[PDB]
Enzyme design. Structure first.
Site, PDB file in Angstrom:
ATOM      1  N   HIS A 161       0.758  -1.242   0.055  1.00 50.77           N
ATOM      2  CA  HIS A 161      -0.025   0.113   0.047  1.00 50.77           C
ATOM      3  C   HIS A 161       0.837   1.275   0.034  1.00 50.77           C
ATOM      4  CE1 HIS A 161      -0.004   0.410   4.285  1.00 50.77           C
ATOM      5  NE2 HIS A 161      -0.029   1.788   4.183  1.00 50.77           N
TER       6      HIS A 161
ATOM      7  N   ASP B  23      -0.784  -7.326   2.022  1.00 47.77           N
ATOM      8  CA  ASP B  23      -0.298  -5.857   1.885  1.00 47.77           C
ATOM      9  C   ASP B  23       1.413  -6.184   2.156  1.00 47.77           C
ATOM     10  OD1 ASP B  23       0.181  -3.345   1.770  1.00 47.77           O
ATOM     11  OD2 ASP B  23      -0.743  -2.780   3.683  1.00 47.77           O
TER      12      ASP B  23
ATOM     13  N   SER C  75       3.748   2.537   8.495  1.00 45.48           N
ATOM     14  CA  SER C  75       3.367   1.429   7.615  1.00 45.48           C
ATOM     15  C   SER C  75       4.679   0.982   6.837  1.00 45.48           C
ATOM     16  CB  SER C  75       2.263   1.886   6.371  1.00 45.48           C
ATOM     17  OG  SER C  75       1.170   2.036   6.943  1.00 45.48           O
TER      18      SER C  75
ATOM     19  N   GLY D 186       2.447   6.858   8.857  1.00 49.25           N
ATOM     20  CA  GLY D 186       3.691   6.860   8.585  1.00 49.25           C
ATOM     21  C   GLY D 186       4.480   5.615   9.270  1.00 49.25           C
TER      22      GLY D 186
END
Length: 247
Positions: free
Chosen positions: A46, A97, A198, A196
């Site tokens: 993502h 993801d 991720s 932030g």
């Protein structure tokens, strides 16, 4: 990271700081990642899906600060940006993801281990800690949901693993959470990953070995009651990782 503590890269030396160059020359922070071998950083799809071009990206290792160089850091171009083909943006709750970045310096080299640059072990397949286990998360994400700025100094915190049974409750996340995901939260909901963070590491100690158990993926807000952080369950992606790291 909401709550938790400041840290430096020595305390998470596999942590990778990933930035994007804009047309115009401006460079902004994108996401975290983890060094799993000298030439390979693992992160979240993502983070990259809207800008899949590898030439857009800069990766640092051995970096403790967001907008300042850390002594000893290494800077890399992205030789290949590999996104998971079964990724889905399913209303917050991203499936599959997970992403790989093959890194290469201007001089054509990969990571060189040092006091500030080191790899993290992958888990055994389908081998995760028991729920209630305390694990750590690391990143440059927001310190408060309402903040505009990201912290200049790297942070980490501790969160506890939550069972799929507990996380699939309607008052938690219901069907948004799959068995390829892991929930983790603080018992008081006072500390968590946030915007932030991720792509960064969820690290658990299994059998004495620091292990990349998860990758920061999604959550409804941050440090909110009954809304854990959600992580890609690395131990369910080992064949994907092994095949694509030969590319």
């Amino acid at each position: 990271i909401i709550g938790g503590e400041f840290t430096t890269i020595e305390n998470q030396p596999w942590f990778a700081a990933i930035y994007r160059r804009h047309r115009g020359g401006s460079v902004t922070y994108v996401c975290g990642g983890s060094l799993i071998s000298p030439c390979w950083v693992i992160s979240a799809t993502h983070c990259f899906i809207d800008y899949p071009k590898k030439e857009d990206y800069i990766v640092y290792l051995g970096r403790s600060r967001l907008n300042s160089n850390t002594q000893g850091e290494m800077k890399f171009e992205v030789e290949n940006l590999i996104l998971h083909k079964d990724y889905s943006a399913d209303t917050l709750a991203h499936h599959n993801d997970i992403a790989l970045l093959k890194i290469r310096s201007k001089e054509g080299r990969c990571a060189q281990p040092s006091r500030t640059i080191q790899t993290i072990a992958l888990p055994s397949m389908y081998n995760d800690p028991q729920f209630g286990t305390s694990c750590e998360i690391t990143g440059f994400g927001k310190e408060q949901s309402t903040d505009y700025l990201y912290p200049e100094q790297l942070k980490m915190t501790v969160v506890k693993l939550i069972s799929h049974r507990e996380c699939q409750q309607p008052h938690y996340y219901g069907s948004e959470v799959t068995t390829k995901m892991l929930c983790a939260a603080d018992p008081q909901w006072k500390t968590d990953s946030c915007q932030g963070d991720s792509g960064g590491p969820l690290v658990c100690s299994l059998q004495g070995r620091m292990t990349l158990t998860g990758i920061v993926s999604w959550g409804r807000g941050c440090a909110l009651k009954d809304k854990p952080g959600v992580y890609t369950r690395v131990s369910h992606f080992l064949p994907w990782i092994r095949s694509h790291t030969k590319e």
